[PDB]
């Protein structure tokens, strides 16, 4: 079975050292060559380094070099990121890919694993309604404010009937922390009369907000 | 050293349509190309080497061809599993680089948005912060826009926007815009809009509140 | 005696990889 896996990846300081590792299984590392590529949350793909085992040859993106440093080891068929002075642009999903080849020039990146996240921030420190009063029927919410780390999860009434609802991607406010709404589009002569419950949880630290809304 | 410019930043098409995203080296890289496709929370996928060679398993609908510097990705027919974004790849450098994708998205409709206004909690006032919101709901297409307005006045510089991907039932988005000022700069004036343009609406739906 | 010999051996073998990246482009473009 010719598999990708890469861990490691969570949650660091800036200016701190992360380290990750790519499991290979189904080739041979060593007879072959690797990448790591990454994605800044909600952006483009970009190459951070490379290595052909068996040509002791490794390189980089300008990007880095001097803080990065990519590696082999041949029996645990296994690839190394070591990440030291990490920043928050450093923050993205970083993945693995191979490249059949044993240089970089001869082939393309073939597989690739299912990427973990690193984020970077300097803070862990971290709720309101939005009232119900364009379509015809009005809409309602569950502004989610300053909690950190991603993500969180909004379901209404526990999910008993939950339809024409959105929960937005989250976005990272200057002060470090993030923040997201929930919203159903709920009919207009129906106002107050049976159920309209939202449903919030935040994993890393505990928390289960149930909330009310309406004039 | 060598920029790839994608075209377009998207495109909107529909099932059976052929579709070609263009790749602009900045100089020669000589077939030495790639094209991904990668889907939301996965993985990207290999889908042509050598500016134009099939990767095994890969649809024959796919296809490349390069001209010079220029490189076009083709697919003859488009099938439901293939909307996603596509990024070219250059690997005749030691600095490997990539274009900034082509968002290939479902060409439905024109259907327009559900605007509501929502006010800052009387809750969130007692903490000392503001933050009004705009809703968009449910639209085709995506370009839209949100002039958030106060006293006729739109101030603005101060509000971000989140989007939903295009859903699976009926591939709308929804928008969601977030105005954001201290409880004194909220404190000062009464009335509070947000006004919508969009392809969907015949001149722009204005909606607002005076606390 | 540390990365003196490490280091510099390392420009070296990449200097020399880089010049046959020229050369491989020089024949692909003909």
Redesign the interface.
């Given at each position: 079975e010719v598999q990708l896996v890469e861990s490691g990846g969570g949650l660091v300081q800036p200016g701190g050292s992360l380290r990750l590792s790519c499991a290979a299984s189904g080739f041979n590392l060593s007879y072959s060559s690797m990448?790591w590529?990454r994605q800044a949350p909600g952006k483009?793909?970009?190459?951070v380094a490379?290595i052909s085992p068996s040509y002791?040859?490794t390189?980089y993106?300008?990007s880095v070099k001097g803080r990065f440093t990519i590696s082999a080891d041949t029996s645990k068929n296994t690839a190394y990121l070591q990440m030291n002075s990490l920043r928050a642009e450093d923050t993205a999903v970083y993945?693995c890919?191979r490249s059949w080849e044993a240089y970089?020039?001869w082939?393309?990146?073939?597989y690739?694993?299912?990427?973990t996240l690193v984020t970077v921030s300097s803070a862990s420190t971290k709720?309101?309604?939005?009232?119900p009063?364009?379509?015809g029927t009005?809409?309602?919410?569950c502004?989610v404010?300053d909690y950190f780390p991603e993500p969180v999860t909004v379901s209404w009434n526990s999910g008993a009937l939950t339809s024409?609802v959105?929960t937005?991607?989250?976005?990272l406010?200057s002060s470090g922390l993030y923040?997201?709404?929930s919203?159903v589009?709920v009919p207009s002569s129906s106002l107050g009369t049976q159920t309209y419950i939202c449903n919030v949880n935040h994993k890393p630290s505990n928390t289960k907000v149930d909330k009310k809304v309406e004039p | 050293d060598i920029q790839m410019t994608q075209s377009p930043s998207s495109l909107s098409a529909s099932v059976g349509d052929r579709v070609t995203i263009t790749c602009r080296a900045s100089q020669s890289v000589s077939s030495?190309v790639?094209w991904?496709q990668?889907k939301p929370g996965?993985?990207?996928?290999?889908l042509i080497?050598?500016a134009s060679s099939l990767?095994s398993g890969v649809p024959s609908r796919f296809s490349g061809s390069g001209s010079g510097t220029d490189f076009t990705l083709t697919i003859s027919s488009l099938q439901p599993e293939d909307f996603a974004t596509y990024?070219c790849?250059q690997?005749?450098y030691?600095?490997?680089?990539?274009?900034?994708?082509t968002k290939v998205e479902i060409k439905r409709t024109v259907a327009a948005?559900?605007?509501?206004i929502?006010?800052?909690?009387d809750?969130?006032l007692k903490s000392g912060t503001a933050?009004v919101?705009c809703?968009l709901?449910?639209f085709y297409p995506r370009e839209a826009k949100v002039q958030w307005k106060v006293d006729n006045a739109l101030q603005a510089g101060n509000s971000?926007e989140?989007?939903?991907e295009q859903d699976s039932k009926d591939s709308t988005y929804?928008l969601?815009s977030?105005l954001?000022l201290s409880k004194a700069d909220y404190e000062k004036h009464k009335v509070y809009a947000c006004e919508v343009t969009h392809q969907g609406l015949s001149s722009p739906?204005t909606?607002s509140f005076n606390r | 005696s540390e990365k003196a010999a490490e280091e510099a051996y390392t420009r070296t073998?990449?200097a020399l990889?880089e010049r046959f990246?020229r050369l491989?482009r020089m024949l692909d473009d003909n």
């Open positions: 990448h590529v483009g793909l970009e190459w490379y002791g040859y390189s993106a300008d993945y890919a970089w020039r082939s393309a990146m073939d690739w694993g299912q990427g709720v309101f309604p939005l009232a009063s364009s379509g009005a809409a309602l919410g502004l404010k024409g959105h937005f991607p989250a976005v406010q923040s997201l709404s919203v589009t | 030495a790639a991904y990668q996965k993985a990207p996928k290999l080497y050598s990767y990024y790849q690997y005749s030691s600095l490997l680089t990539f274009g900034q994708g948005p559900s605007v509501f929502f006010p800052p909690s809750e969130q933050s919101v809703l709901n449910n971000q989140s989007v939903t929804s969601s977030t954001t739906v909606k | 073998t990449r990889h990246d491989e």
